[PDB]
Amino acid sequence: SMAVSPSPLRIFTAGGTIDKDYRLEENGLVVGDPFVAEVLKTARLAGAVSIVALSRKFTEADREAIGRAVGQAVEDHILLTHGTDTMVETARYLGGLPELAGKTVVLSGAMVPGRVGGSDAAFNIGFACAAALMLAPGVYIAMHGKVFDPAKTRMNRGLGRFEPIDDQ
Amino acid sequence: SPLRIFTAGGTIDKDYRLEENGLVVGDPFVAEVLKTARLAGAVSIVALSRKDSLDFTEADREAIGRAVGQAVEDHILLTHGTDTMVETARYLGGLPELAGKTVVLSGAMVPGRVGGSDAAFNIGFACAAALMLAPGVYIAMHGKVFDPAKTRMNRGLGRFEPI
Amino acid sequence: SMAVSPSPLRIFTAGGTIDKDYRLEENGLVVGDPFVAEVLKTARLAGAVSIVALSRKFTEADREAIGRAVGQAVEDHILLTHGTDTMVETARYLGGLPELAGKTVVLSGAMVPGRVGGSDAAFNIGFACAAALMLAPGVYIAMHGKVFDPAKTRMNRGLGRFEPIDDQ
Amino acid sequence: SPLRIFTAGGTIDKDYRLEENGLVVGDPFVAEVLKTARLAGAVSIVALSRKDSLDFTEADREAIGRAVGQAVEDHILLTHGTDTMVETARYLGGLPELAGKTVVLSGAMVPGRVGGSDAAFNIGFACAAALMLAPGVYIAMHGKVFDPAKTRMNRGLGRFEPI
Ligand SMILES: [Cl-]
Ligand SMILES: [Cl-]
Predict the structure, then answer these.
(1) Residue B125: its chain A contacts at CB < 8 A?
(2) If interface means Cβ-Cβ distance under 8 Å, which residues of chain A face chain C?
(3) CA distance A141 to A156
(4) Yes or no, beta carbons of B41 and A144 under 8 Å apart
(5) What is the spatial distance between Cα A7 and Cα B46, in angstroms, rounded to a whole number?
(6) Closest among C10, C145, C6, C120 to C66, alpha carbons compared
(7) DSSP 8-state symbol, A67
(8) Phi-psi region of C80 (alpha: psi -120 to 50; beta: other; left: phi over 0)
(9) By CB neighbour count within 10 A (0-12 exposed, 13-18 middle, 19+ buried), where does C71 fall?
(10) β-strand C50-53 against C28-31: which pairing, if any?
(11) In degrees, to the nearest 5, what angle opens at C-alpha D142 toward C-alphas D138 and D145?
């Protein structure tokens, strides 16, 4: 009965801008290795986090595999790192799965790749890990130091941020 | 909810100076992290100290408490050295003046301006904790929330641990 | 007659991978501000270096403007930061201009953008600045910790480096 | 020409350690810069010391001289602390054993592992200097080549300057 640190959070990675990295062959960026693993490596965690790579790019098949992976996890606190362009569509899909009803599921990512100077990625990862641990069960987007309801959120391209959709 | 951030120095903020041939407490690293965070909402940062957290007196903790009480915000982050973080947190937890606020202390084991630092992760985690936790005083480090009354720094592990 | 530090090196910037940076609007890299200025800012220079931006991308017109700028400089030590894909063509062009005959002219750049993690850029800039100051008059490519003769150099794409062309 | 790199410690190599609550001389930063330099040619790196350059004795300088003499390479870079860089350089310049070699000393005013360091620029500049300069001993810092016999560190400027 010595103390055992639990590992209540599992992270799944689905690619996106957060993970982009330069390749000579492409003369540009590709979706690379998961940047969340780099951030957690130096986080001096008390426990650990289980990080599972799902994809590196989006068909209903791809969202369905994500829902299967999230639903089959033993953990009830889940972070999914993802591209911002279809994050709302994935989040809305996950919110329709009854098997997620007792889980806190947070999607996050970055507007700037983690491997590019001046990125929001490390901040967003810390914020989203906490959100996944602390929010009540449901599906959320955590970006810009804010929690978003997927049914009432859109990307504002001129602003470069997600914004809430006001009730009419 | 608007977040108020206070900076009290510590390892997180250390930076190299030629004159000292070593590290000193420099400008608050939380401002560098939040500059690139693309924040959607209400934040402001206030400097309180750059003094060594080992050199904080009961008078210094009383002045930090009064400064946090000056904020009308009910969500507070205080960046601080880890050496006496538990002493400041326990002091703040005893002030009836702060009872409606969520106050989170955080910092870093490695300076933000040194390679391989925990600082940016800790700032994001602690900002969320200050917005989401119920009223009280907490330490947010190591991807965990600690109760100050039941926490110590374990120098053998280089981490806070529960008592 | 107190000591005055000379500024014998002038730098011209013509863009390339070295200067690439992420933009939200593009969802990828563009040619950004000159990365050589960022490196020299923290170099604690004894003197200074004059950095002039020429272009951010290549027509004979573009090479001709570069030759005009280099030939009109008062300095006899010149570094041009440039993309690696046509560096040999620019260098060979400059080597044909008699008005450059007393100048040491070095071209350099980076295989990885300076603003991406793990870049060769800062090393290449320090190496190329020294090369421009120390080599005898002529036109050179300085990359990979090596000096290349433009008439006897090609990019080896499989290798990701310039290589010499052996005499037959 | 093959370059041999020797590492004698100094600010360039400093890194943060929890146990010290500050910087110590860590692993050689020149190895980190050259790992990403995509080098075309012949290089090797040899560790000599992590001892404080202020604490180098005449015996230590004699041992650095003998170590540089063990290299068959005629192009040498020695990374070193700036406090006694001029003393080591002047000592090496007097060794007839080294007369055919180009030996360049360099380092950094800011540790390579601290943000805003001169280290990577200084390493690239000093590698080129070691390949290109005529036989002799030099200091390569601040984008300049210094003659050790005619150089001092000006602590008021934070730069080497000619005498
Ligand atoms: Cl791209
Ligand atoms: Cl220190």
Answers:
(1) 126-127, 129-130
(2) 17, 21-22, 24-25, 27-29, 85, 111-113, 115-118, 157, 160
(3) 14
(4) yes
(5) 35
(6) C10
(7) H
(8) beta
(9) middle
(10) unpaired
(11) 25
Q: Which residues of A touch C27 (CB under 8 A)?
A: 17, 85
Catalytic residue positions of D? 11
Residue D139 structure tokens: 């200091």
Q: What are the phi and psi torsion angles at A15 (to 5°)?
A: 90, -145
**Among residues D109, D161, D115, D113, which one has the least CA distance to residue D16?**
D113
* Structural domains present in chain B: 3-162 (3.40.50.1170)
Experimental method: X-ray
Resolution in A: 1.2
- Cα of A60 to nearest chain B Cα, Å: 30
Q: In what order do the strands lie in the sheet with B102-106?
A: B43-47, B3-7, B75-79, B102-106, B136-141, B144-146
Q: Are A162 and A114 in contact (CB under 8 A)?
A: no
Cα distance from A148 to chain C (closest Cα, Å)?
20
Listing DSSP states for B84-145 in one string gives: THHHHHHHHHT-GGGTTSEEEEE--SS-TTBTT-SHHHHHHHHHHHHHHSPSEEEEEETTEE
Could you tell me where the DSSP H helices lie in A42-107? 60-72, 87-95
Distance, in Å, from the CA atom of D44 to the CA atom of C145, rounded to the nearest integer, reads 13
Residue of D6, D140, D125 whose CA lies nearest to D151: D140
Answer yes or no: are the C-beta atoms of C153 and C61 closer than 8 Å: no
Please give the structure tokens belonging to residue C68: 């005009």
Rounded Cα–Cα distance for residues C82 and C108 (Å): 6
Judged by CB atoms closer than 8 Å, whether chains meet at C145 and D120 is answered as: no
Question: Which residues on chain A place their C-beta less than 8 Å from a C-beta of chain B?
Answer: 3, 9, 39-40, 42-47, 49, 111-112, 118-120, 122-131, 134-135, 142-147, 160-163
> Exposed (0-12), middle (13-18) or buried (19+): which is D97, by Cβ within 10 Å?
exposed
What is the Cα–Cα distance from D11 to D5, expressed in whole angstroms? 17
Distance B85 CA to ligand 2 centre (A): 20
> Which helix H or strand E contains B153, and what residues bound it?
strand B151-154
The sign one gets for the Cα dihedral D86, D87, D88, D89 is positive
Show which subunits contact C, needing at least 3 CB pairs below 8 angstroms: A, D
A127 and B132 in contact by Cβ < 8 A?
Answer: no
Which residues, 6+ apart, have CB-to-CB distance to A68 below 8 Å?
none
φ, ψ of residue A49 to 5 degrees: the values are -130, 135
Structure tokens that stand for A159 in this block: 């602003």
Region of residue C138 (phi > 0: left; psi between -120 and 50: alpha; otherwise: beta): left
CB contact set of C167 (below 8 Å; sequence gap of 6+): C152
Q: How far apart are CA C103 and CA C70, in angstroms?
A: 9
Long-range CB pairs of B143-151 (<8 Å, 24+ gap) are B143/A9, B143/A40, B143/A43, B143/A45, B143/A46, B143/A47, B143/A49, B143/A129, B144/A45, B144/A46, B144/A47, B148/B86, B148/B89, B148/B90, B148/B93, B148/B105, B149/B90, B149/B93, B151/B86, B151/B89
Distance, CA of D59 to CA of D103 (rounded, Å) = 19
What sign for the dihedral angle of Cα D76, D82, D86, D87? negative
Closest-CA residue of D relative to B108 is: D18
Beta bridge partner(s), residue A15: none
* Residue C17 phi, psi (nearest 5): -55, -40
Phi, psi of D14 (to 5 degrees): -70, 150
| Under 8 Å between Cβ of A42 and B117 | yes
